[PDB]
Amino acid sequence: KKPTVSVFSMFRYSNWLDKLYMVVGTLAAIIHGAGLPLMMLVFGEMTDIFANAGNLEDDTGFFMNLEEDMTRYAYYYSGIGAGVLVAAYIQVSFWCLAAGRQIHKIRKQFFHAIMRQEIGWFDVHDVGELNTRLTDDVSKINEGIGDKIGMFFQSMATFFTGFIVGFTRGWKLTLVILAISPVLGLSAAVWAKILSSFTDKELLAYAKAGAVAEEVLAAIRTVIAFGGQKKELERYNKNLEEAKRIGIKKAITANISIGAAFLLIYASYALAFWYGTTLVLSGEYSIGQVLTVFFSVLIGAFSVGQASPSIEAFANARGAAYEIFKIIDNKPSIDSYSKSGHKPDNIKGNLEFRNVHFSYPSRKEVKILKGLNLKVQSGQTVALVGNSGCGKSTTVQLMQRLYDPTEGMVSVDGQDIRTINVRFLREIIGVVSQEPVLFATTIAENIRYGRENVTMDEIEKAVKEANAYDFIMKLPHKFDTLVGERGAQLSGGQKQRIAIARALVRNPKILLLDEATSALDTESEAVVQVALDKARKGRTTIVIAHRLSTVRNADVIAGFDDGVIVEKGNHDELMKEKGIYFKLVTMQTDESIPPVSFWRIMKLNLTEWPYFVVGVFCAIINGGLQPAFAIIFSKIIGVFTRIDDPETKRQNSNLFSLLFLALGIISFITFFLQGFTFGKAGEILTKRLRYMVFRSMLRQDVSWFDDPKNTTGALTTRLANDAAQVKGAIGSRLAVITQNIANLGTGIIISFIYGWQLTLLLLAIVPIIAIAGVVEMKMLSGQALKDKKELEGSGKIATEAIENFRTVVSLTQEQKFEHMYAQSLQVPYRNSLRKAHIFGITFSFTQAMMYFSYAGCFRFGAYLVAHKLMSFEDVLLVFSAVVFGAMAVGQVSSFAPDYAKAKISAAHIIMIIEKTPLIDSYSTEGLMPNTLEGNVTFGEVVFNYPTRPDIPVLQGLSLEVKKGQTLALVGSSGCGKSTVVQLLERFYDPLAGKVLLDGKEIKRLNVQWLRAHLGIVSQEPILFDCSIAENIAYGDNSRVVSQEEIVRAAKEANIHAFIESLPNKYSTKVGDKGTQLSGGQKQRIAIARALVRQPHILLLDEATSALDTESEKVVQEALDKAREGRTCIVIAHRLSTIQNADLIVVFQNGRVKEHGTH
């Protein structure tokens, strides 16, 4: 379990106004949450007074009273609307502002801490993790401290307010609904579990066939070489039959379970309202109280569930922020920002190392230094020589205060480096690295990085002394030319000379050189060397380099070995001692996817039309019942709004409740029918699409496969996951569209039948709510995209900084980098403030229009009832039939798996299916001559790989072999041997030239007919997850193979001497799940599989390159008989294995260099 930091440390950076924002936003969120159940209370009381005035009606004085007091209730609604408007605006705006400020401070402090850390801490964490953290986990913190906390508080406030308003009216109904609530919770949990697990269970069911699919797409070469498509396709089809069976069972079980859960919650609602009606008949409650309690408690209980995503967001926010807080709190051993320490002056430049012991913290168990003791006087030149990894780089890093030594001390002019502060020490010492890194900025700012207060004239003087004066003038924009990867790629020496200019502009007292000219060509090496030896004068320098010519003129050329100093002398002394230096001297000297339209996708499933017809006819009746639910609800509510004897009221109330239950039962059975039929249609669609796409993939040649855009993983994703969503485009899409259409139509029509004015007003005030919702979603998406695109600018600076941590630390420019990051953060800060304000406004308007809509609609309804245009029951009918219809439309649309993913999947699926290969495998259009002979010839054969068309893989190849003659094709891996094997198998058609079979080109022959006559054994013998008998029978596919042929093939391959050793001989299973076999045995079974077909031409491709000698002898024994009487092609990396070969051809980038005999 990942640790968390909790409240005491999560908020942390919050000064004054931040906590004020937090508290005000929380209070506003509480008000906003508590508003809604109060609006329900007003609804209940207004309904009660409407019924009271109606039964008073059931003369104009109390009608005027109705007008005025309903106007007062409209005022109540408008006041609630204004209050929730201001509360929502305040909550969203203040929480977003507080989160933005807090996260801005967090980002600044986190970058500052990362720049503060010592190199040692940086070396135990990879570079790639830090930037990905700084982006993603900071975004997660933004999610955690954003509006989510406000929404969580609003949800809890709704829960508590609903329960409180329920309990203050009547405890009986609240207790009944609360005791029913566990049933609703359990049913919702079941629905969530079954709905979520559906895809994972689908994957689990498919895994069986997916294993075979993955196996085939990894050995495509052999499959197409042996012509096994017409058998592996059928195996895949059988596994798909099994998958289809299990998927059908899963679909029916899941559908019936979901139907049962929905019927359960529906009956729970029905029972609760029936008990409410029974209480009403007893005279203890009124309609208003029952409506208020029921709706309030239900909405509170539903709202308490809405807080779960907020809780999860908070939890992952803490989990992400724990690492950041740990990193920032980590005080390093050496603090570059520390002002403490000595501040020396007039530094002469002497250096002293005494007993210096040091090891890398990453590899502490390995010791690098063994007590260095080095004396350097100011003024002269001291160089260090030695082998790679002998502490030279470690010595340089320790010199400039990067790693403190384990034991011993280093002093400058007799003063310890520990006493001196890090900043001044690093500023004094100048260092030149082996591989300079240049920032993506103009040369002017690159030089400016050396020091802040350097004048332009000083820059010019430094460049003149750095020999870069001449070359810079040739640049298009002189000293302001943009350089780096985006700028023109400068020469290798240009980077080195501008780096030495950057070092020299600081005018350092002590200079360090780490392989200055190691990675430079000689022409620029001479220039940079003369620059180095001109700049070396007047300063004390330490130089380490592999080339001894540069350090030949050094005053003291000290040797280095095993982290200790043994030999110390000059050129003459070193060359007279005949030590390590003398030996070194003597040895050196997505994309454009065209949409395919709904009609084509529907055509992909035209054959199963009866399933679609019954599904649509079931979806019509399923959808059209939500308005019926509304009608029955309004009728039962209005039952008590008329004056009659109690017994008739009880009778018809029970009748309506029973009708409600019966309609629920009908809904359950229709939902089961529709779900089952659509699921079966979709599964048949998926099975047929998988079969056809696998057929098409097996039909096309390898030119498709070699493309790296679509690898084995991509293809198996297409087969497994991509094709499973096609049923989202047709089927379920038709279901949701039809359901929504019927739900809107029935409600609109019945409302028009009952009352046209009120339904007109609703048809005018509901679309604006929907358009407000969609506008809010569009604004949110645009805001997120703009935020990411703007923050990419600061991310670029962050990446440029972190990846060059060594150089930026060495150049003590961390302050400048932080300052540059400051403004790049500052602009998005203002953008975030503006986005917070606009989001507050739009969310306030979205969440407020409902109350004003209620007020206006019910005012219009009251006016209508005032003059007996309609009845209150009709008002409730035309209100419910529209509002519940809209909510149901939204929810049903949410239920379905949208449409965009299905569309983008169907585009790929159709483009793959319709893709006709250049060389059609299944086509019978091809010449069928008699038995083949073996006169293979090549003329001017030219071919280019799809991956590397520019690289010459085949250019004018011309080789010849005759009947019954052994030829060899030796060469480096992938130099043409694979290409000629593939083209003989007809895997790649050469761009130019003719490959003649029996003196005639291989173009006019049918693919299977020509491929059936060749024998291919590759370097890695790939075997399939089946039996040994099946594997050997795979060798030929034109006819079945009996047991005796297998026996004689094994005897010829000599594997039979080992097959009997197996417990189950021929019946032994082979593969990963079976018994493991060695390389020699696998090669023997592979050559047996080659021989069983008995081709008259066979090719070997580096097969004997991975065989142990004991098994190699038996393999050669079998191959000596195999090659006798047959034409053989030999490819191998061993000269001994090709000694018996007669003819050899050597490939040179596809150009024949030497062909003929061995």
Ligand SMILES: CC(=O)O[C@H]1C(=O)[C@@]2(C)[C@H]([C@H](OC(=O)c3ccccc3)[C@]3(O)C[C@H](OC(=O)[C@H](O)[C@@H](NC(=O)c4ccccc4)c4ccccc4)C(C)=C1C3(C)C)[C@]1(OC(C)=O)CO[C@@H]1C[C@@H]2O
């Ligand atoms: C008077 C009236 O119509 O009231 C509504 C209703 O009040 C609300 C709250 C309903 C109601 O649903 C819930 O209470 C509910 C709660 C949690 C999870 C799922 C449902 C309703 O029960 C559910 C019912 O919805 C449906 O019938 C859907 O089409 C849904 N139904 C069933 O699955 C079902 C099957 C057999 C028996 C009863 C229902 C459906 C969803 C997807 C695919 C096919 C069908 C409706 C609109 C109502 C009630 C009755 C209160 C909601 O249901 C839907 C999906 O329409 C919840 O979200 C909507 C919003 C509606 O306003």
Ligand SMILES: Nc1ncnc2c1ncn2[C@@H]1O[C@H](COP(=O)(O)OP(=O)(O)OP(=O)(O)O)[C@@H](O)[C@H]1O
């Ligand atoms: N971060 C590190 N972790 C572990 N060992 C390291 C690390 N950095 C350097 N070393 C060690 O230092 C040596 C490599 O040093 P570096 O790459 O700077 O060049 P070098 O060996 O001095 O010479 P050259 O110029 O030929 O590369 C190796 O012995 C290596 O084990």
